[PDB]
Design a protein around this motif. Structure first.
Motif, PDB file in Angstrom:
ATOM      1  N   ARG A 116     -14.515  -4.006   5.557  1.00 17.74           N
ATOM      2  CA  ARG A 116     -13.687  -4.801   7.034  1.00 17.74           C
ATOM      3  C   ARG A 116     -14.755  -5.264   7.504  1.00 17.74           C
ATOM      4  O   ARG A 116     -15.063  -6.334   7.741  1.00 17.74           O
ATOM      5  CB  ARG A 116     -12.222  -3.870   7.025  1.00 17.74           C
ATOM      6  CG  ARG A 116     -11.495  -4.657   7.918  1.00 17.74           C
ATOM      7  CD  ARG A 116     -10.755  -3.516   7.972  1.00 17.74           C
ATOM      8  NE  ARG A 116      -9.309  -4.111   8.367  1.00 17.74           N
ATOM      9  CZ  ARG A 116      -8.029  -3.568   9.027  1.00 17.74           C
ATOM     10  NH1 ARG A 116      -7.918  -2.194   7.603  1.00 17.74           N
ATOM     11  NH2 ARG A 116      -7.036  -3.670   9.654  1.00 17.74           N
TER      12      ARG A 116
ATOM     13  N   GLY B 296      -2.682   0.754   7.116  1.00 13.30           N
ATOM     14  CA  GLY B 296      -3.794   0.454   6.976  1.00 13.30           C
ATOM     15  C   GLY B 296      -4.089  -0.388   6.656  1.00 13.30           C
ATOM     16  O   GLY B 296      -5.167  -1.490   6.817  1.00 13.30           O
ATOM     17  N   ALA B 297      -3.102  -2.001   6.946  1.00 16.77           N
ATOM     18  CA  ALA B 297      -3.092  -3.457   6.780  1.00 16.77           C
ATOM     19  C   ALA B 297      -1.827  -4.251   7.782  1.00 16.77           C
ATOM     20  O   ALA B 297      -2.575  -5.697   7.934  1.00 16.77           O
ATOM     21  CB  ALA B 297      -2.098  -3.570   5.440  1.00 16.77           C
ATOM     22  N   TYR B 298      -1.066  -3.297   8.437  1.00 20.15           N
ATOM     23  CA  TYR B 298      -0.121  -4.707   9.887  1.00 20.15           C
ATOM     24  C   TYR B 298      -0.188  -3.541  11.206  1.00 20.15           C
ATOM     25  O   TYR B 298      -1.200  -2.625  11.334  1.00 20.15           O
ATOM     26  CB  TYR B 298       0.734  -4.375   8.887  1.00 20.15           C
ATOM     27  CG  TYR B 298       1.284  -4.862   7.518  1.00 20.15           C
ATOM     28  CD1 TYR B 298       0.789  -6.336   7.857  1.00 20.15           C
ATOM     29  CD2 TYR B 298       1.371  -4.021   6.563  1.00 20.15           C
ATOM     30  CE1 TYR B 298       1.003  -6.548   6.004  1.00 20.15           C
ATOM     31  CE2 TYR B 298       0.713  -4.665   5.250  1.00 20.15           C
ATOM     32  CZ  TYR B 298       0.920  -5.633   4.398  1.00 20.15           C
ATOM     33  OH  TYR B 298       1.453  -6.462   3.474  1.00 20.15           O
TER      34      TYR B 298
ATOM     35  N   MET C  61       3.424  -4.277  -1.888  1.00 16.86           N
ATOM     36  CA  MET C  61       2.027  -3.189  -2.717  1.00 16.86           C
ATOM     37  C   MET C  61       3.880  -1.923  -2.720  1.00 16.86           C
ATOM     38  O   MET C  61       3.921  -2.174  -2.143  1.00 16.86           O
ATOM     39  CB  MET C  61       1.356  -2.200  -1.700  1.00 16.86           C
ATOM     40  CG  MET C  61       0.243  -2.826  -1.257  1.00 16.86           C
ATOM     41  SD  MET C  61      -0.744  -3.297  -2.464  1.00 16.86           S
ATOM     42  CE  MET C  61      -1.547  -1.607  -2.958  1.00 16.86           C
TER      43      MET C  61
ATOM     44  N   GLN D  13       1.188   4.800   4.891  1.00 11.80           N
ATOM     45  CA  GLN D  13      -0.472   4.414   4.245  1.00 11.80           C
ATOM     46  C   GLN D  13      -0.415   2.607   4.438  1.00 11.80           C
ATOM     47  O   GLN D  13      -2.068   2.627   5.399  1.00 11.80           O
ATOM     48  CB  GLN D  13      -0.859   5.223   2.705  1.00 11.80           C
ATOM     49  CG  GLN D  13      -2.184   5.644   2.548  1.00 11.80           C
ATOM     50  CD  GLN D  13      -2.192   6.769   1.768  1.00 11.80           C
ATOM     51  OE1 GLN D  13      -3.231   6.005   0.623  1.00 11.80           O
ATOM     52  NE2 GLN D  13      -2.493   8.080   2.320  1.00 11.80           N
ATOM     53  N   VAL D  14      -0.060   1.791   3.361  1.00 11.13           N
ATOM     54  CA  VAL D  14      -0.225   0.761   3.428  1.00 11.13           C
ATOM     55  C   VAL D  14       0.152   0.399   4.488  1.00 11.13           C
ATOM     56  O   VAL D  14      -0.501  -0.885   5.352  1.00 11.13           O
ATOM     57  CB  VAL D  14       0.869   0.030   2.179  1.00 11.13           C
ATOM     58  CG1 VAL D  14       0.403  -1.307   2.843  1.00 11.13           C
ATOM     59  CG2 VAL D  14       0.318   0.402   1.009  1.00 11.13           C
TER      60      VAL D  14
ATOM     61  N   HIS E 123      -6.747  -4.197  -1.761  1.00 10.46           N
ATOM     62  CA  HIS E 123      -5.731  -4.548  -0.572  1.00 10.46           C
ATOM     63  C   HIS E 123      -6.456  -4.044   0.347  1.00 10.46           C
ATOM     64  O   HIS E 123      -7.083  -3.147   1.149  1.00 10.46           O
ATOM     65  CB  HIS E 123      -4.031  -3.761  -0.529  1.00 10.46           C
ATOM     66  CG  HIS E 123      -3.024  -3.957   0.254  1.00 10.46           C
ATOM     67  ND1 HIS E 123      -2.663  -3.683   1.407  1.00 10.46           N
ATOM     68  CD2 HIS E 123      -2.519  -5.214  -0.388  1.00 10.46           C
ATOM     69  CE1 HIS E 123      -1.735  -4.306   1.721  1.00 10.46           C
ATOM     70  NE2 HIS E 123      -1.709  -4.812   0.928  1.00 10.46           N
ATOM     71  N   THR E 124      -6.015  -4.607   1.747  1.00 10.16           N
ATOM     72  CA  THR E 124      -6.443  -4.602   2.791  1.00 10.16           C
ATOM     73  C   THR E 124      -6.330  -2.734   3.076  1.00 10.16           C
ATOM     74  O   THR E 124      -7.549  -2.610   4.027  1.00 10.16           O
ATOM     75  CB  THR E 124      -5.250  -5.046   4.298  1.00 10.16           C
ATOM     76  OG1 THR E 124      -6.005  -6.656   4.189  1.00 10.16           O
ATOM     77  CG2 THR E 124      -6.183  -4.371   5.607  1.00 10.16           C
ATOM     78  N   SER E 125      -4.876  -2.574   3.097  1.00 11.35           N
ATOM     79  CA  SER E 125      -4.933  -1.092   3.351  1.00 11.35           C
ATOM     80  C   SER E 125      -6.059  -0.058   2.294  1.00 11.35           C
ATOM     81  O   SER E 125      -5.948   1.448   3.025  1.00 11.35           O
ATOM     82  CB  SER E 125      -3.624  -0.368   3.489  1.00 11.35           C
ATOM     83  OG  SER E 125      -2.474  -0.156   1.619  1.00 11.35           O
TER      84      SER E 125
ATOM     85  N   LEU F 157      -5.928 -10.831   6.824  1.00 13.37           N
ATOM     86  CA  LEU F 157      -5.523  -9.536   7.119  1.00 13.37           C
ATOM     87  C   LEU F 157      -4.524  -9.480   5.597  1.00 13.37           C
ATOM     88  O   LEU F 157      -3.173 -10.079   7.059  1.00 13.37           O
ATOM     89  CB  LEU F 157      -5.456  -8.237   7.716  1.00 13.37           C
ATOM     90  CG  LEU F 157      -7.113  -8.415   8.206  1.00 13.37           C
ATOM     91  CD1 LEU F 157      -6.707  -8.072   9.862  1.00 13.37           C
ATOM     92  CD2 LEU F 157      -7.703  -8.151   7.087  1.00 13.37           C
ATOM     93  N   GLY F 158      -3.333  -8.317   5.355  1.00  8.47           N
ATOM     94  CA  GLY F 158      -2.390  -7.888   5.209  1.00  8.47           C
ATOM     95  C   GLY F 158      -2.190  -8.395   3.092  1.00  8.47           C
ATOM     96  O   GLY F 158      -1.341  -8.033   2.916  1.00  8.47           O
TER      97      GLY F 158
END
Ligand SMILES: CC(C)(COP(=O)(O)OP(=O)(O)OC[C@H]1O[C@@H](n2cnc3c(N)ncnc32)[C@H](O)[C@@H]1OP(=O)(O)O)[C@@H](O)C(=O)NCCC(=O)NCCS
Ligand SMILES: CC(C)(COP(=O)(O)OP(=O)(O)OC[C@H]1O[C@@H](n2cnc3c(N)ncnc32)[C@H](O)[C@@H]1OP(=O)(O)O)[C@@H](O)C(=O)NCCC(=O)NCCS
Ligand SMILES: NC[C@@H]1O[C@H](O[C@H]2[C@@H](O)[C@H](O[C@@H]3[C@@H](O)[C@H](N)C[C@H](N)[C@H]3O[C@H]3O[C@H](CO)[C@@H](O)[C@H](O)[C@H]3N)O[C@@H]2CO)[C@H](N)[C@@H](O)[C@@H]1O
Ligand SMILES: NC[C@@H]1O[C@H](O[C@H]2[C@@H](O)[C@H](O[C@@H]3[C@@H](O)[C@H](N)C[C@H](N)[C@H]3O[C@H]3O[C@H](CO)[C@@H](O)[C@H](O)[C@H]3N)O[C@@H]2CO)[C@H](N)[C@@H](O)[C@@H]1O
Ligand SMILES: [Ca+2]
Ligand SMILES: [Ca+2]
Ligand SMILES: [Ca+2]
Lengths: 187, 187
Positions: free
Chosen positions: B16, A110-112, A44, A106-107, B7-9, B41-42
């Motif tokens: 989810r 939300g994702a990691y 992203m 935020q990414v 996106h995951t985020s 994810l990610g």
């Protein structure tokens, strides 16, 4: 004020506009290489444009960071790695960098499992202020032909943002931490 | 059928949990593990919904694939890895799988040098049809403590989609290809 876009959905002029702005922003031998741009792709992008012009950019890309806990277990953490954070020089000191990192965090959140980056020794206080944790231990990279090889030059540069670690895990920043392999700078 | 890409985020909590529930069931020790979900994810998710419920999922996440060319040069290829492609039991053979892969391939062509995946047997024709290359050489993983270890179980499963290889790279499917390290199924 930042727009989040996957590399996927960047049109050619946005890619060229971003790359050109980032290359110039890291000039004080071209400091920002072809490998540095490769590192910024596949995740992203946080973009801020004003009147058709790109004035700010950042990317968060997925990789694995390897960390062995004192129970000996061994973890390959889903990492959002921060790359190519840049603001057009005349537009600096007005919160644009903050806005880019606000969007990248935020990414990451939300994702990691963890955010990571290897800050230019100039930007280090900006990260420290956002609640990024300085690594204190030795840093290394998992190479394909050698094994885990030390990266002493990146020991003072590495910042982590542990957002959602697995199991019970709390990082000890004095332990070793290992990145996965790529060409150019591993960190 | 059109898949939406997210996106995951940007997934809300209910979407989810919805995706994981549908994917676990489609694959039905559950066959789809906690590591399998971690692997999905990610990155970018392709979602298809009907009557307020998810009927198709897939995901493309970033990793590195290591390949050595005949000139001896090692490449760490920016890989869009396809995970968790699933269509609800009652909706199979209506092209939903095709719509999921169309959207994920948009991401792979738009952001990566190569696409890859380790297909279940039932999914094989779907990939062969779309023009994914079956691998003919030995597969391996780059481990943290043992070096590159053969993954003979995965030799028959590996598909790649070579979209933007670096200069002077002839992909030969007879040669060895190595994935980067993660917990669970390395491929
Ligand atoms: C690093 C960089 C992205 C900062 O962007 P910026 O828009 O100047 O930063 P902001 O105004 O949002 O401020 C960032 C923080 O740095 C400090 N700072 C204050 N004034 C600053 C200024 N004029 N320039 C840079 N940092 C400043 C503050 O801690 C500030 O936090 P604040 O928003 O609460 O004041 C930008 O200067 C840049 O592109 N530098 C060259 C490339 C580079 O080194 N970037 C990435 C390194 S990892
Ligand atoms: C994803 C999955 C549902 C396949 O989805 P699907 O909706 O059945 O697939 P589609 O209908 O889009 O197409 C499947 C392919 O089967 C093939 N096919 C079509 N008609 C067929 C028939 N009568 N007999 C056999 N194969 C046929 C074609 O290659 C078709 O692609 P096309 O319709 O674009 O030509 C199936 O792989 C699955 O969900 N199984 C459980 C989860 C799983 O194993 N996923 C693994 C991903 S590696
Ligand atoms: N002429 C300006 C130059 O600016 C440079 O700025 C810094 C950056 O270019 C680079 O910063 C770090 C680096 O510290 C660390 N040890 C490795 C890490 N990959 C680099 O990363 C940073 O810069 C590169 C671009 O070079 C970006 O791709 C990357 O996303 C960014 N986080 O290394 C320099 C820090 O030493 C140098 N300070 C120096 O060469 C010189 O002053
Ligand atoms: N054992 C044969 C068949 O296996 C099927 O399940 C298959 C899948 O679950 C799984 O497929 C591959 C696997 O082959 C390969 N060697 C490793 C790869 N990571 C797996 O991956 C696949 O399944 C997993 C879920 O388990 C997903 O997380 C992944 O995204 C998917 N592409 O491994 C199984 C072997 O192909 C079905 N349960 C059923 O049709 C039958 O039992
Ligand atoms: Ca550089
Ligand atoms: Ca499984
Ligand atoms: Ca369980």
């Amino acid at each position: 004020t930042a727009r989040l876009i996957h590399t996927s959905d960047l049109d050619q002029e946005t890619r060229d506009g971003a790359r050109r702005m980032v290359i110039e922003a890291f000039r004080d031998t071209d400091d920002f290489t072809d490998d540095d741009w490769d590192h910024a792709l596949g995740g992203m992008h946080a973009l801020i444009s004003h009147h058709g012009a790109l004035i700010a950019h950042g990317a968060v890309v997925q990789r694995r960071l390897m960390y062995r806990g004192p129970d000996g277990r061994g973890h390959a953490l889903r990492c959002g790695y921060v790359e190519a954070v840049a603001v057009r020089e005349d537009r600096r000191g007005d919160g644009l960098g903050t806005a880019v990192l606000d969007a990248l965090e935020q990414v990451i959140r939300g994702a990691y499992q963890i955010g990571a980056l290897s800050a230019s020794d100039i930007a280090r206080p900006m990260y420290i202020a956002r609640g990024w944790l300085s690594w204190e231990g030795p840093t290394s990279v998992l190479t394909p032909t050698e094994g885990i090889v030390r990266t002493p030059e990146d020991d003072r540069s590495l910042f982590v943002l542990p957002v959602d670690l697995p199991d019970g895990l709390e990082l000890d920043t004095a332990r070793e931490i290992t990145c996965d392999w790529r060409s150019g700078d591993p960190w």
